[PDB]
Short mmCIF file of C-alpha atoms in Angstrom, two decimals:
data_model
loop_
_atom_site.label_atom_id
_atom_site.label_comp_id
_atom_site.label_asym_id
_atom_site.label_seq_id
_atom_site.Cartn_x
_atom_site.Cartn_y
_atom_site.Cartn_z
CA UNK A 1 87.77 4.67 -143.52
CA UNK A 2 84.56 3.08 -142.02
CA UNK A 3 86.94 1.57 -139.40
CA UNK A 4 88.16 4.84 -138.12
CA UNK A 5 84.55 5.90 -137.55
CA UNK A 6 83.43 2.57 -136.00
CA UNK A 7 85.92 2.87 -133.16
CA UNK A 8 85.07 6.62 -132.66
CA UNK A 9 81.35 6.00 -132.53
CA UNK A 10 82.15 3.08 -130.21
CA UNK A 11 84.26 5.68 -128.40
CA UNK A 12 81.38 8.14 -127.49
CA UNK A 13 78.61 5.30 -127.18
CA UNK A 14 80.52 3.95 -124.17
CA UNK A 15 80.61 7.67 -122.95
CA UNK A 16 76.86 8.18 -123.39
CA UNK A 17 76.32 4.74 -121.61
CA UNK A 18 78.31 5.88 -118.58
CA UNK A 19 76.44 9.32 -118.66
CA UNK A 20 73.07 7.40 -118.68
CA UNK A 21 74.26 5.10 -115.78
CA UNK A 22 75.00 8.25 -113.73
CA UNK A 23 71.57 9.53 -114.43
CA UNK A 24 70.12 6.35 -113.24
CA UNK A 25 72.16 6.60 -110.03
CA UNK A 26 71.00 10.08 -109.24
CA UNK A 27 67.37 9.21 -109.85
CA UNK A 28 67.61 6.26 -107.65
CA UNK A 29 68.85 8.62 -104.91
CA UNK A 30 66.15 11.14 -105.43
CA UNK A 31 63.63 8.28 -105.34
CA UNK A 32 64.99 7.24 -101.95
CA UNK A 33 64.88 10.81 -100.67
CA UNK A 34 61.23 10.97 -101.59
CA UNK A 35 60.54 7.54 -100.09
CA UNK A 36 62.13 8.83 -96.81
CA UNK A 37 60.12 12.13 -96.81
CA UNK A 38 57.20 10.04 -97.32
CA UNK A 39 57.74 7.67 -94.52
CA UNK A 40 58.15 10.69 -92.06
CA UNK A 41 54.86 12.16 -93.32
CA UNK A 42 53.32 8.83 -92.63
CA UNK A 43 54.39 9.07 -89.05
CA UNK A 44 53.47 12.81 -88.80
CA UNK A 45 50.02 11.83 -89.99
CA UNK A 46 49.61 9.03 -87.42
CA UNK A 47 50.54 11.31 -84.51
CA UNK A 48 48.23 13.97 -85.73
CA UNK A 49 45.32 11.48 -86.01
CA UNK A 50 46.30 10.38 -82.38
CA UNK A 51 46.19 13.95 -80.95
CA UNK A 52 42.85 14.45 -82.81
CA UNK A 53 41.67 11.35 -80.76
CA UNK A 54 42.85 12.58 -77.32
CA UNK A 55 41.23 16.01 -78.11
CA UNK A 56 37.85 14.31 -79.03
CA UNK A 57 38.34 12.27 -75.81
CA UNK A 58 38.99 15.48 -73.78
CA UNK A 59 35.91 17.06 -75.48
CA UNK A 60 33.52 14.21 -74.37
CA UNK A 61 34.91 14.42 -70.78
CA UNK A 62 34.19 18.12 -70.79
CA UNK A 63 30.73 17.76 -72.40
CA UNK A 64 29.96 15.16 -69.61
CA UNK A 65 30.98 17.33 -66.77
CA UNK A 66 29.21 20.34 -68.25
CA UNK A 67 26.00 18.42 -68.54
CA UNK A 68 26.36 17.37 -64.89
CA UNK A 69 27.12 21.05 -63.68
CA UNK A 70 24.01 22.28 -65.71
CA UNK A 71 21.67 19.65 -64.30
CA UNK A 72 22.72 20.32 -60.71
CA UNK A 73 22.06 24.10 -61.56
CA UNK A 74 18.66 23.39 -63.05
CA UNK A 75 17.80 21.20 -60.11
CA UNK A 76 18.73 23.97 -57.75
CA UNK A 77 16.69 26.41 -59.80
CA UNK A 78 13.62 24.15 -59.78
CA UNK A 79 13.84 23.79 -56.00
CA UNK A 80 14.12 27.53 -55.60
CA UNK A 81 11.19 28.16 -57.92
CA UNK A 82 8.93 25.59 -56.12
CA UNK A 83 9.84 27.45 -52.68
CA UNK A 84 9.19 30.75 -54.45
CA UNK A 85 5.77 29.96 -55.94
CA UNK A 86 4.04 27.12 -54.02
CA UNK A 87 1.95 28.45 -51.06
CA UNK A 88 0.63 25.22 -49.68
CA UNK A 89 3.43 23.62 -47.52
CA UNK A 90 2.20 19.98 -48.36
CA UNK A 91 2.11 20.85 -52.08
CA UNK A 92 5.56 22.36 -51.72
CA UNK A 93 7.18 19.41 -50.11
CA UNK A 94 5.37 16.99 -52.44
CA UNK A 95 6.72 18.90 -55.47
CA UNK A 96 10.31 19.04 -54.23
CA UNK A 97 10.41 15.45 -52.95
CA UNK A 98 8.79 14.33 -56.26
CA UNK A 99 11.59 16.07 -58.32
CA UNK A 100 14.25 14.38 -56.18
CA UNK A 101 12.81 10.93 -56.70
CA UNK A 102 13.03 11.33 -60.52
CA UNK A 103 16.71 11.52 -60.36
CA UNK A 104 17.72 9.81 -57.09
CA UNK A 105 15.55 6.65 -57.39
CA UNK A 106 13.80 6.00 -54.11
CA UNK A 107 10.28 4.88 -52.82
CA UNK A 108 9.67 6.89 -49.67
CA UNK A 109 10.77 10.21 -48.39
CA UNK A 110 10.03 11.86 -45.07
CA UNK A 111 11.07 15.04 -43.28
CA UNK A 112 11.58 14.87 -39.57
CA UNK A 113 11.90 17.76 -37.26
CA UNK A 114 13.79 17.70 -34.18
CA UNK A 115 12.93 19.27 -30.67
CA UNK A 116 16.47 19.32 -29.29
CA UNK A 117 15.24 20.40 -25.87
CA UNK A 118 12.57 17.71 -25.44
CA UNK A 119 14.68 14.92 -27.00
CA UNK A 120 12.01 14.15 -29.38
CA UNK A 121 11.32 14.06 -33.19
CA UNK A 122 8.15 14.68 -35.30
CA UNK A 123 7.00 13.73 -38.84
CA UNK A 124 6.78 17.04 -40.64
CA UNK A 125 6.03 15.55 -44.11
CA UNK A 126 5.78 11.99 -45.50
CA UNK A 127 5.60 10.43 -49.00
CA UNK A 128 5.39 6.62 -48.59
CA UNK A 129 4.95 4.25 -51.57
CA UNK A 130 3.70 1.58 -49.21
CA UNK A 131 1.39 1.12 -46.19
CA UNK A 132 3.07 0.80 -42.90
CA UNK A 133 1.91 -0.97 -39.67
CA UNK A 134 -0.25 1.13 -37.32
CA UNK A 135 2.15 0.22 -34.59
CA UNK A 136 5.05 2.10 -36.21
CA UNK A 137 3.24 5.32 -37.21
CA UNK A 138 4.16 7.67 -34.40
CA UNK A 139 3.87 11.31 -35.50
CA UNK A 140 5.97 12.08 -32.45
CA UNK A 141 8.48 9.99 -30.55
CA UNK A 142 11.43 10.31 -28.10
CA UNK A 143 14.95 10.57 -29.47
CA UNK A 144 17.14 9.97 -26.35
CA UNK A 145 19.46 7.06 -27.19
CA UNK A 146 18.49 6.68 -30.89
CA UNK A 147 20.90 7.10 -33.75
CA UNK A 148 19.05 10.39 -34.19
CA UNK A 149 20.25 11.50 -30.83
CA UNK A 150 23.68 10.28 -31.98
CA UNK A 151 23.86 11.87 -35.45
CA UNK A 152 21.95 14.96 -34.27
CA UNK A 153 24.62 17.23 -35.48
CA UNK A 154 26.03 15.72 -38.81
CA UNK A 155 27.12 17.74 -41.65
CA UNK A 156 27.47 15.06 -44.20
CA UNK A 157 24.83 12.75 -45.98
CA UNK A 158 24.57 9.21 -44.51
CA UNK A 159 24.10 6.34 -46.94
CA UNK A 160 23.46 2.95 -45.37
CA UNK A 161 22.29 -0.52 -46.48
CA UNK A 162 19.55 -2.28 -44.86
CA UNK A 163 20.54 -5.81 -43.58
CA UNK A 164 24.19 -4.78 -43.55
CA UNK A 165 24.26 -1.52 -41.51
CA UNK A 166 21.21 -2.18 -39.38
CA UNK A 167 23.30 -2.88 -36.07
CA UNK A 168 24.84 0.66 -36.76
CA UNK A 169 21.35 2.19 -35.72
CA UNK A 170 21.13 0.39 -32.39
CA UNK A 171 18.45 -1.85 -31.01
CA UNK A 172 15.87 0.89 -31.16
CA UNK A 173 14.26 1.22 -34.50
CA UNK A 174 15.76 -2.04 -35.69
CA UNK A 175 12.10 -3.15 -35.57
CA UNK A 176 11.49 -0.50 -38.28
CA UNK A 177 14.69 -1.02 -40.39
CA UNK A 178 14.00 -4.81 -40.57
CA UNK A 179 10.29 -4.13 -41.30
CA UNK A 180 11.50 -2.01 -44.21
CA UNK A 181 13.76 -4.89 -45.26
CA UNK A 182 10.52 -7.12 -45.38
CA UNK A 183 8.91 -4.53 -47.61
CA UNK A 184 11.86 -4.88 -50.17
CA UNK A 185 13.83 -1.90 -48.89
CA UNK A 186 17.75 -2.16 -49.32
CA UNK A 187 19.07 1.32 -48.90
CA UNK A 188 18.34 4.39 -46.59
CA UNK A 189 19.66 7.92 -47.02
CA UNK A 190 19.73 10.54 -44.34
CA UNK A 191 20.47 14.17 -44.84
CA UNK A 192 20.64 16.74 -42.01
CA UNK A 193 18.70 19.97 -42.33
CA UNK A 194 20.50 22.86 -40.77
CA UNK A 195 18.99 26.36 -40.74
CA UNK A 196 20.01 28.47 -37.59
CA UNK A 197 23.36 27.08 -36.95
CA UNK A 198 21.57 24.01 -35.70
CA UNK A 199 20.16 20.81 -37.03
CA UNK A 200 16.41 21.53 -37.20
CA UNK A 201 15.58 18.17 -38.84
CA UNK A 202 16.47 15.27 -41.22
CA UNK A 203 15.49 14.47 -44.86
CA UNK A 204 15.22 10.69 -45.37
CA UNK A 205 14.85 8.28 -48.40
CA UNK A 206 14.44 4.61 -48.76
CA UNK A 207 15.10 2.83 -51.95
CA UNK A 208 14.46 -0.67 -53.20
CA UNK A 209 17.98 -1.07 -54.73
CA UNK A 210 21.34 0.16 -53.35
CA UNK A 211 22.56 3.11 -55.30
CA UNK A 212 26.22 3.81 -55.50
CA UNK A 213 26.46 7.39 -54.08
CA UNK A 214 29.19 9.53 -55.49
CA UNK A 215 30.85 12.33 -53.65
CA UNK A 216 29.18 14.48 -56.41
CA UNK A 217 25.75 12.97 -55.61
CA UNK A 218 26.21 13.65 -51.98
CA UNK A 219 27.26 17.23 -52.51
CA UNK A 220 24.17 17.89 -54.59
CA UNK A 221 21.84 16.39 -52.08
CA UNK A 222 23.51 18.41 -49.35
CA UNK A 223 22.98 21.47 -51.42
CA UNK A 224 19.29 20.69 -52.04
CA UNK A 225 18.73 19.84 -48.28
CA UNK A 226 20.00 23.37 -47.59
CA UNK A 227 17.09 24.93 -49.58
CA UNK A 228 14.52 22.46 -48.15
CA UNK A 229 15.83 23.11 -44.60
CA UNK A 230 15.07 26.82 -44.64
CA UNK A 231 11.54 26.18 -46.27
CA UNK A 232 11.03 23.84 -43.47
CA UNK A 233 12.20 26.47 -40.87
CA UNK A 234 9.85 28.88 -42.57
CA UNK A 235 6.77 26.61 -42.54
CA UNK A 236 7.32 25.87 -39.01
CA UNK A 237 7.40 29.61 -38.14
CA UNK A 238 4.25 30.50 -40.20
CA UNK A 239 2.66 27.38 -38.52
CA UNK A 240 3.40 28.72 -35.15
CA UNK A 241 2.13 32.32 -36.04
CA UNK A 242 -1.12 30.78 -37.37
CA UNK A 243 -2.12 29.03 -34.16
CA UNK B 1 88.44 -9.74 -137.95
CA UNK B 2 88.59 -6.81 -135.52
CA UNK B 3 85.98 -5.05 -137.76
CA UNK B 4 83.56 -8.01 -137.28
CA UNK B 5 83.64 -7.45 -133.62
CA UNK B 6 83.64 -3.55 -133.67
CA UNK B 7 80.20 -3.49 -135.46
CA UNK B 8 78.78 -6.31 -133.14
CA UNK B 9 79.93 -4.58 -129.95
CA UNK B 10 78.60 -1.34 -131.51
CA UNK B 11 75.50 -3.58 -132.08
CA UNK B 12 74.87 -4.43 -128.49
CA UNK B 13 76.21 -0.95 -127.03
CA UNK B 14 73.21 0.72 -128.80
CA UNK B 15 71.08 -1.94 -127.18
CA UNK B 16 72.37 -1.39 -123.65
CA UNK B 17 71.99 2.37 -124.23
CA UNK B 18 68.24 1.95 -125.14
CA UNK B 19 67.84 -0.42 -122.14
CA UNK B 20 69.39 2.31 -119.79
CA UNK B 21 67.20 4.94 -121.37
CA UNK B 22 64.10 2.89 -120.50
CA UNK B 23 65.31 2.49 -117.01
CA UNK B 24 65.61 6.30 -116.68
CA UNK B 25 62.07 6.70 -117.98
CA UNK B 26 60.60 4.30 -115.47
CA UNK B 27 62.60 5.95 -112.57
CA UNK B 28 61.28 9.33 -113.69
CA UNK B 29 57.66 7.97 -113.43
CA UNK B 30 58.12 6.32 -110.04
CA UNK B 31 59.63 9.75 -108.77
CA UNK B 32 56.58 11.62 -110.08
CA UNK B 33 54.33 9.08 -108.35
CA UNK B 34 56.20 9.61 -105.15
CA UNK B 35 55.88 13.32 -105.75
CA UNK B 36 52.17 13.01 -106.03
CA UNK B 37 51.75 10.81 -102.87
CA UNK B 38 53.84 13.34 -101.01
CA UNK B 39 51.74 16.31 -102.07
CA UNK B 40 48.59 14.51 -100.97
CA UNK B 41 50.17 13.78 -97.62
CA UNK B 42 51.11 17.53 -97.42
CA UNK B 43 47.40 18.38 -97.76
CA UNK B 44 46.22 15.71 -95.48
CA UNK B 45 48.62 16.97 -92.82
CA UNK B 46 47.28 20.43 -93.13
CA UNK B 47 43.60 19.50 -92.74
CA UNK B 48 44.65 17.34 -89.58
CA UNK B 49 46.48 20.23 -88.20
CA UNK B 50 43.36 22.36 -88.84
CA UNK B 51 40.89 19.88 -87.17
CA UNK B 52 43.36 19.74 -84.17
CA UNK B 53 42.84 23.54 -84.16
CA UNK B 54 39.10 23.50 -84.18
CA UNK B 55 39.15 20.78 -81.42
CA UNK B 56 41.41 22.88 -79.15
CA UNK B 57 38.94 25.84 -79.80
CA UNK B 58 35.98 23.64 -78.92
CA UNK B 59 37.85 22.51 -75.74
CA UNK B 60 38.38 26.18 -74.49
CA UNK B 61 34.77 26.97 -75.27
CA UNK B 62 33.96 23.96 -73.10
CA UNK B 63 36.26 24.70 -70.29
CA UNK B 64 34.92 28.33 -70.08
CA UNK B 65 31.31 27.22 -69.91
CA UNK B 66 32.29 24.56 -67.45
CA UNK B 67 33.95 27.12 -65.23
CA UNK B 68 30.92 29.39 -65.42
CA UNK B 69 28.73 26.47 -64.45
CA UNK B 70 30.85 25.54 -61.38
CA UNK B 71 31.12 29.17 -60.12
CA UNK B 72 27.31 29.52 -60.31
CA UNK B 73 27.07 26.23 -58.36
CA UNK B 74 29.61 27.22 -55.78
CA UNK B 75 28.01 30.63 -55.36
CA UNK B 76 24.60 28.72 -54.80
CA UNK B 77 26.36 26.58 -52.23
CA UNK B 78 27.78 29.55 -50.38
CA UNK B 79 24.39 31.27 -50.22
CA UNK B 80 22.88 28.03 -48.92
CA UNK B 81 25.63 27.53 -46.38
CA UNK B 82 25.38 31.00 -45.02
CA UNK B 83 21.57 30.69 -44.62
CA UNK B 84 22.29 27.27 -43.00
CA UNK B 85 24.80 28.40 -40.51
CA UNK B 86 24.48 32.10 -39.61
CA UNK B 87 21.98 32.82 -36.79
CA UNK B 88 22.15 36.64 -36.67
CA UNK B 89 19.91 38.07 -39.53
CA UNK B 90 22.10 41.20 -40.01
CA UNK B 91 25.12 38.98 -40.19
CA UNK B 92 23.46 36.65 -42.49
CA UNK B 93 22.31 39.37 -45.04
CA UNK B 94 25.74 41.15 -44.70
CA UNK B 95 27.64 37.92 -45.60
CA UNK B 96 25.38 37.19 -48.64
CA UNK B 97 25.34 40.74 -50.00
CA UNK B 98 29.12 40.73 -49.39
CA UNK B 99 29.68 37.71 -51.57
CA UNK B 100 27.48 39.23 -54.41
CA UNK B 101 29.44 42.41 -54.27
CA UNK B 102 32.66 40.48 -55.00
CA UNK B 103 31.38 39.17 -58.29
CA UNK B 104 28.73 41.63 -59.37
CA UNK B 105 30.57 44.88 -58.67
CA UNK B 106 28.31 47.45 -56.78
CA UNK B 107 28.47 49.93 -53.98
CA UNK B 108 25.34 49.62 -52.10
CA UNK B 109 22.75 47.01 -51.55
CA UNK B 110 19.34 47.13 -49.75
CA UNK B 111 16.53 44.63 -49.21
CA UNK B 112 13.12 46.17 -49.21
CA UNK B 113 10.00 44.43 -47.86
CA UNK B 114 6.47 45.07 -49.23
CA UNK B 115 3.17 45.42 -47.28
CA UNK B 116 0.95 44.82 -50.20
CA UNK B 117 -2.24 45.69 -48.16
CA UNK B 118 -0.93 49.04 -46.83
CA UNK B 119 0.62 49.93 -50.06
CA UNK B 120 3.99 50.64 -48.23
CA UNK B 121 7.59 49.36 -48.28
CA UNK B 122 10.08 49.16 -45.48
CA UNK B 123 13.96 48.85 -45.34
CA UNK B 124 14.74 45.40 -44.20
CA UNK B 125 18.46 45.52 -44.51
CA UNK B 126 20.92 47.98 -45.93
CA UNK B 127 24.59 48.16 -46.90
CA UNK B 128 25.59 51.55 -48.03
CA UNK B 129 29.10 52.66 -49.16
CA UNK B 130 28.10 56.27 -48.72
CA UNK B 131 26.34 58.54 -46.27
CA UNK B 132 22.71 59.54 -47.49
CA UNK B 133 20.80 62.73 -46.59
CA UNK B 134 18.75 62.59 -43.51
CA UNK B 135 15.68 63.73 -45.81
CA UNK B 136 15.85 60.61 -47.85
CA UNK B 137 16.04 57.92 -44.98
CA UNK B 138 12.66 56.77 -44.52
CA UNK B 139 12.66 53.24 -42.99
CA UNK B 140 8.95 52.94 -43.98
CA UNK B 141 7.17 54.85 -46.87
CA UNK B 142 4.15 54.61 -48.99
CA UNK B 143 4.22 52.76 -52.36
CA UNK B 144 1.00 53.91 -54.02
CA UNK B 145 2.02 55.38 -57.44
CA UNK B 146 5.74 54.39 -57.32
CA UNK B 147 7.46 52.30 -59.89
CA UNK B 148 7.40 49.73 -56.85
CA UNK B 149 3.66 49.78 -57.03
CA UNK B 150 4.07 49.38 -60.76
CA UNK B 151 6.63 46.52 -60.75
CA UNK B 152 5.18 44.87 -57.60
CA UNK B 153 4.83 41.67 -59.55
CA UNK B 154 7.90 41.31 -61.79
CA UNK B 155 9.57 37.97 -62.46
CA UNK B 156 12.65 39.36 -64.18
CA UNK B 157 15.58 41.42 -62.94
CA UNK B 158 15.51 45.05 -63.85
CA UNK B 159 18.79 46.78 -64.88
CA UNK B 160 18.53 50.46 -65.50
CA UNK B 161 20.92 53.39 -66.10
CA UNK B 162 20.96 56.37 -63.99
CA UNK B 163 20.52 59.73 -65.97
CA UNK B 164 19.13 57.66 -68.91
CA UNK B 165 16.26 55.56 -67.40
CA UNK B 166 15.36 57.93 -64.56
CA UNK B 167 11.95 59.12 -66.28
CA UNK B 168 10.98 55.36 -66.26
CA UNK B 169 10.65 55.50 -62.42
CA UNK B 170 8.21 58.49 -62.42
CA UNK B 171 8.57 61.86 -60.67
CA UNK B 172 8.59 60.13 -57.18
CA UNK B 173 11.94 59.02 -56.23
CA UNK B 174 13.54 61.02 -59.12
CA UNK B 175 14.73 63.02 -56.15
CA UNK B 176 16.63 59.96 -54.94
CA UNK B 177 17.78 58.67 -58.40
CA UNK B 178 19.35 61.88 -59.25
CA UNK B 179 20.85 62.23 -55.69
CA UNK B 180 22.60 58.92 -56.38
CA UNK B 181 23.69 60.27 -59.73
CA UNK B 182 25.39 63.14 -57.83
CA UNK B 183 27.14 60.49 -55.61
CA UNK B 184 28.58 58.96 -58.73
CA UNK B 185 26.15 56.20 -59.31
CA UNK B 186 25.42 55.07 -62.86
CA UNK B 187 23.46 51.78 -62.69
CA UNK B 188 20.64 50.42 -60.48
CA UNK B 189 19.64 46.63 -60.40
CA UNK B 190 16.26 45.46 -59.02
CA UNK B 191 15.44 41.85 -58.26
CA UNK B 192 12.08 40.66 -57.04
CA UNK B 193 11.97 38.53 -53.96
CA UNK B 194 9.09 35.92 -54.36
CA UNK B 195 8.23 33.43 -51.69
CA UNK B 196 4.73 32.58 -51.16
CA UNK B 197 3.53 32.96 -54.68
CA UNK B 198 3.79 36.68 -53.96
CA UNK B 199 6.51 39.29 -54.11
CA UNK B 200 7.49 39.89 -50.70
CA UNK B 201 10.18 42.36 -51.41
CA UNK B 202 12.97 43.64 -53.49
CA UNK B 203 16.75 43.14 -53.65
CA UNK B 204 18.45 46.25 -55.07
CA UNK B 205 22.00 47.30 -55.96
CA UNK B 206 23.70 50.39 -57.23
CA UNK B 207 26.95 50.61 -58.98
CA UNK B 208 29.38 53.27 -59.97
CA UNK B 209 29.92 51.89 -63.48
CA UNK B 210 27.33 50.34 -65.88
CA UNK B 211 27.73 46.74 -66.12
CA UNK B 212 26.62 44.85 -69.13
CA UNK B 213 24.15 42.28 -67.78
CA UNK B 214 24.03 39.00 -69.65
CA UNK B 215 21.06 36.75 -69.75
CA UNK B 216 23.37 34.36 -67.86
CA UNK B 217 24.14 36.98 -65.20
CA UNK B 218 20.49 37.84 -64.78
CA UNK B 219 19.49 34.20 -64.30
CA UNK B 220 22.15 33.66 -61.70
CA UNK B 221 20.96 36.74 -59.82
CA UNK B 222 17.36 35.56 -60.09
CA UNK B 223 18.46 32.18 -58.67
CA UNK B 224 20.40 33.85 -55.77
CA UNK B 225 17.45 35.98 -55.05
CA UNK B 226 15.24 32.86 -54.65
CA UNK B 227 17.44 31.71 -51.69
CA UNK B 228 17.58 35.24 -50.12
CA UNK B 229 13.77 35.60 -50.61
CA UNK B 230 12.95 32.54 -48.31
CA UNK B 231 15.54 33.55 -45.68
CA UNK B 232 13.97 37.03 -45.77
CA UNK B 233 10.48 35.38 -45.26
CA UNK B 234 11.91 33.31 -42.58
CA UNK B 235 13.51 36.21 -40.67
CA UNK B 236 10.15 38.26 -40.92
CA UNK B 237 8.41 35.24 -39.34
CA UNK B 238 10.82 34.66 -36.58
CA UNK B 239 10.80 38.47 -36.01
CA UNK B 240 7.08 38.44 -35.58
CA UNK B 241 7.06 35.39 -33.21
CA UNK B 242 9.78 37.21 -31.00
CA UNK B 243 7.65 40.25 -30.25
#
């Protein structure tokens, strides 16, 4: 009798074994399904960490631009406050040219006024970080045939290197430009001062080192020169009245 | 003999069955490991999608501020360009007060000059969107005892509602304020014009609807009034010279 059973327990043992083998097969599938879902999530996580990266790039771009925009504004407010509160013209143009120097690095600043009818220019204000030869200190001088005569109607800022753009200013004043070169000057910036609908003068700076002037920088200077231009026009008028 | 084998194949069949059952147990573990790793990645993916969200919030904040900063700048440039290029004082102050109206919505603008010694104010420029009674059109008038006398040295912009802050301007000019109320006016803005270190006048606007004036708005107006203040000072000077 124990032989009847032994082939019938052998019977279903091979059955359980096949059942267990099918369970293994299904679990191996499930595992691979999970392995797939997991590798997709690894990719999804990588793109998300990348987009996060771009977005923090874009934020730092925007924070830089916004700091630039707010400095320009603050500069414009400072200029406007000085013109609003300082009564002495010399202290006014010292204060303003001072603030400019502490962001556009330069040594000397000068404001020139233009008498368009007499073809002559005069030194309105000067801030020099160096002594200049007696032979070059003309408080008034003729303009006819100078670069000044030439660029007497500009609307853009002029940035020029000493020793490289000196011929662009003609033989006149080449004695001064090359003198400035001997004092260590490498760059000159010129900015027209327009107030009526005319150029009433020029704001001018010289620097020891050539700055690379961005379109943003030039636009800011041009904006600052607008405010200075009308303060200059206003000082000239009150100076006339006072005499 | 087939009974010797049957208990020895039964022997190892139960062995294979236990081996297969251990393989099931290990695969079930592995599966749960993968199920765990997966649920962590589901969480990691959610935080990353959240940080992405914050970062695009922060970007839109920054793009809004940056557009505000650039508009302020452009406004300041436009004012400076007008003062730089427009020769006729009336066209100048029309152009500038025009641009202001198209961002600060108001109906009428006026520029008042102050004679501090004579305690009297004069209408320098006016842009009215309404006809006003003959009996209120004084081109010059005394100041002594007016709000003007009172706020003759402000440094902030004054924003006041008609019908609600009328008593704050005293019995004088309450005939005008309430007249303006009858013409549909609800808000008045006053902005001191400082040029020497003194208040040389006032820029003033009336609007049909009460605007909510932010600290940002007031600072911008105050900045614009700086430029207008010195153009006014300059027109008054050239007007003196011309006589």
